[PDB]
UniProtKB/Swiss-Prot annotation:
Gene this chain is encoded by: arfB
Keywords attached to this entry: Cytoplasm, Hydrolase, Translation regulation
Record keyword Signal present: no
Quaternary structure and interacting proteins, as annotated: Associated with 70S ribosomes and polysomes.
Catalytic activity: an N-acyl-L-alpha-aminoacyl-tRNA + H2O = an N-acyl-L-amino acid + a tRNA + H(+)
Taxonomy of the source species: Bacteria, Pseudomonadati, Pseudomonadota, Gammaproteobacteria, Enterobacterales
Protein species of origin: Escherichia coli (strain K12)
Protein location: Cytoplasm
GO biological process, one term: rescue of stalled ribosome
Protein family membership: Belongs to the prokaryotic/mitochondrial release factor family.
GO molecular function (one): peptidyl-tRNA hydrolase activity
UniProt note: domains: The unstructured C-terminal region is required for ribosome binding and peptidyl-tRNA hydrolase activity. The C-terminal tail functions as a sensor to discriminate between stalled and actively translating ribosomes by binding in the mRNA entry channel downstream of the A site between the head and shoulder of the 30S subunit. This allows the N-terminal globular domain to sample different conformations, so that its conserved GGQ motif is optimally positioned in the peptidyltransferase center (PTC) to catalyze the hydrolysis of peptidyl-tRNA.
Name this polypeptide is given: Peptidyl-tRNA hydrolase ArfB
Length: 121
């Protein structure tokens, strides 16, 4: 249900979940498998309230597109079924951060960040 608030909870069917894999042959130090999940959520296409639509769209995140889409890449487990659930945790979190401004009543703990994006042309 991705319950973000008292009147906000995605039924887990309004998202675009897709699989992501890579070949073995890499040009760097790589030998482990991929078997990851791509979680794409089109806010414009969701049942979200207008207030959240604007909050998410007006946000500035190295994982979101100005278009109105958030992208997450969960990769930890050896299957392609456990990462689909590890991705929702990240969605719920970033949504709660981008929709707010400052808070300490709920657990909140920032940290470093490792990631880039691939803009298409």
């Amino acid at each position: 249900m991705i319950v973000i608030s008292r009147h906000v909870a995605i039924p887990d069917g309004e998202l675009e979940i897709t699989a992501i894999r890579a070949q073995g042959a890499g040009g760097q130090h790589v030998n482990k498998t991929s078997t990851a999940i791509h979680l794409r959520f089109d806010i414009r296409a969701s049942s979200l309230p207008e207030y959240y639509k604007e909050r998410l769209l007006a946000a500035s995140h190295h994982l979101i597109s100005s278009d109105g889409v958030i992208v997450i890449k969960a990769q930890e487990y050896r299957s392609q079924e456990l990462n689909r659930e590890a991705a929702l945790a990240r969605l719920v979190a970033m949504i709660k951060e981008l929709t707010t401004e400052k808070k300490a009543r709920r657990p909140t703990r920032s940290g470093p960040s490792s990631g880039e994006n691939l803009y298409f042309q």
